[model samples]
Target: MFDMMDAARLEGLHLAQDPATGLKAIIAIHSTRLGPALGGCRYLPYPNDEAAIGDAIRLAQGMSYKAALAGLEQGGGKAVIIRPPHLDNRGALFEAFGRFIESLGGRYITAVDSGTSSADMDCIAQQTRHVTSTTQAGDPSPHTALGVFAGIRASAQARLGSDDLEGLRVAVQGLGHVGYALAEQLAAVGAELLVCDLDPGRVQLAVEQLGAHPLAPEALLSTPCDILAPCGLGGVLTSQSVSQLRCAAVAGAANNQLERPEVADELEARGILYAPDYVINSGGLIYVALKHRGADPHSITAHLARIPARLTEIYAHAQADHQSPARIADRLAERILYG
Candidate 1:
């Protein structure tokens, strides 16, 4: 497996094993042309060993592109822990995983992602001094969601000719960390919140915290709302979901939100304003980069506010060129990387 990852010449990739906790972690550094590789640490039950490694590599590569499009100075990387979701010794496992990260010599930095949380990162930080994307000041997910909210406001202004969020019905498809945080923003602004999630506990939490009305998981995409925030997983908006969607805008933190690049064109044709995932989801990355560089938080917040402005440019370019938003984003990132 190491040979295969090396043969791919993926810039940097390696596996770390901690026999104490019976934990195996893989860190894939997809690129570093812009800076050190930065991405998330995700915990999931892999169906097989091969699937775990493949996911780590592919997700890391995507992070590279995402970082590029977001105009960040960092490249992309990802860490994955291969273990059954039902394992009893999670804290020990994550702590061992942190040891793996510490052994990297600061080549790859980690943050929270998907099934992981700030609490998990807190554990990782004890073993390694190189982790970011978590803070004792506040939850990073909400800050990331705030960045996405700012982007959504920018999208609303450009597409709907209005920045006011009041009275808009927004559908949140995932009630995870970022999704729930985003829902808070929409709810605070007087936007009606509709939410759906695979976890009943999360759905109930959203109901209590944000007063969101629940929708069936499968019906979430087609729910009639002004904006559809997919904060769950990737590959949700395919040709089929695109045809079924009833929202006016797409903005969320989920990576690879589009199944294919051409789906952006499909979205445009359907009159749905599709914000590029990388551009919209860059707030967390920006925040992590700031922490990694030991910079001031205020400066980071000031810089993050520009995400909306940058995304506005990407939207215009995609519309004018008649290309997918991701394609336009890639070109823009390449220009920044090379020039």
Candidate 2:
């Protein structure tokens, strides 16, 4: 049951259960070298408790690296709540989860992710102060989408020899808040789009509103395109998907896109310029962290504006060293966190 923990260096693992509210959750803190661990609360239905724990641990560790790479003062941590049969009583569950977070005494702070939203964070805030992404902070998806758009352009310049997306074909998987926002940005620039999502409404909306071509969700990775933007879940670039991918570059808002470390080498060997997810998707974290610190909007926007320059640096180093961007990014993050 604890075998997964052996794969990563975890600082702490906590479980919270409240039978009355049917709240079952796990909070994993991967590091605290920089400061208090800050990550989002992901609510999903997992096959079992082990899978939930594994996901929590992996996400927590990724958050640590993400924060380090983004130059945030926070460490890494993540929370996952096993979704109940009915979400009607989510308020009570979040309150319970919030109390659990408060018990840590600021060791971990929760925000919004995937199945969670600002409204959920409001409920968590009801019980503890260690929460962000409330209604006041607004949605972080647009900021995140903006950063990813910048990253996709950087990738295009690095791999396609051109930064202009006017005619580039981009396949974007998932049409969630972040994914849809990214597609809209790409469309506004006249980039041809292939969009897929589990939500038919979202897929139809992208097709009708953004003038994006619709693709089956399952065929997104294999479809021919200049760039494959995986705005969905992680592990999309595994051994099989890597071989099947038909894109010159891979960049998106997903975390931990690589199934394993070696996948980076595979991507490089295939001539697929892979932007490190942490670096490209750090905008949301930057926005939330700034809000948490009470920074003004202009200050936050300024910081977010630097994401492209940072990616440019990473791309330059990768090209000079003949290394994948993921490798370059990991080394940079480790240097910041360890050295």
Candidate 3:
């Protein structure tokens, strides 16, 4: 098992197991400095227990930075439910997981992420009030996609000399809810799309409906394009792969996209504009946070609209200081949380 305090700077790590419901979950709280820790609950299979724990810890930390930079009062936390080979009783498992969240006493809140949906959040809500992104509030993926789209436009403005996405070639990796929605937005703007997904059905849909050219999954990151949008899993941009990237800029909805922090400098050295993942992918968090406070749609839309301006600020600072935007974003977030 990973040591939460040592490796992750986590405040708390709680585990829950229910043999009856076949539920095994981990909730990692990275901080509570700003306010309650809030993040999504991801239920997926892992190679081992340690991998799941490490993911929870890192994602929780990212959520903290995300909330701080997005100007939300909430802190950072994340929950991971280890999926067994069989998922015969998902309702019972989520309810069991919900009780674990309730035990936190408002220290943490759960929402939806990969392998989980608004329907699943509804089930989790039945056991605790500390949940968001349920069916009532609607799926947050579209909001997340919109935020990323705004960030991409800002990045293009900085690097390509205009905010216009039209005529630009954007290679999008992954076709999940957020990624697919982003593709739709990009296509609507007359931007050429090169998309790839593990699901053949999703790839075909994009190719037929959005006029996207299909790329092989393995070739997505290195494909020639004006921008490379990684909406899939994180850690895809490593030292080895950074040299292979051909895009002028990288902006997407995935969290912790860099395999290591140092890779940001490598991307900078290569003259590739790298949008900090936490900053660019914070739309869903902003949506959920506003909904949690019972704010109106206007408030949520206003907050999300500010994402591009925030990215522009980060990009300006990065250029002025000749540092990676990732480092500049980290400093900005730290000042908000610790100052």
lDDT of 3 by residue, 76-157 (tens): 9999999889878889888888888899888999988879988888899998999998888877889889999999999999
Q: For each candidate, what TM-score against the reference? A: 0.86, 0.92, 0.92
**Which predicted model would earn the best TM-score?**
3
Mark the 10 consecutive residues where model 2 has the least summed lDDT. 1-10
Worst 10 residues of 1 by lDDT: 133-142
Candidate 3, which ten residues in sequence have the lowest lDDT sum? 1-10
Pick by lDDT: which candidate is best?
3
Model 2 CA lDDT for position 212: 94
Off by over 4 Å in 1: 1-9, 18-20, 84-95, 133-137, 199-213, 337-339
**Reference-based lDDT, residue 246, model 1:** 90
Pitting candidate 1 against candidate 2, the one with the higher lDDT is 2
Q: In order, what lDDT does every prediction score?
A: 0.82, 0.90, 0.91
In model 2, state the lDDT of residue 283: 94
Between prediction 1 and prediction 2, which has the larger TM-score?
A: 2
Residue 319, candidate 3: how far off, in angstroms?
A: 0.8
Q: After superposition, how far is residue 300 of candidate 2 from its true place, in Å?
A: 1.4
Once model 1 is optimally superposed onto the true structure by TM-score, how far is the C-alpha of residue 235 displaced, in angstroms? 2.3
Over 1-339, each residue of candidate 2 has an lDDT whose tens digit, in order, gives: 356665777878999988988999999998899989999899999999988999999889889999998877899999999988876687888899999999999999999877997888888998999999898777788889999999999889888888999989999999998999999999999999999999999999999999999989888889999999999988889999999999999999987789999999999999999999999999999988988978788988887888878888999999999998889998897787668
| Stretches > 4 Å off in candidate 2 | 1-6, 84-88, 296-298
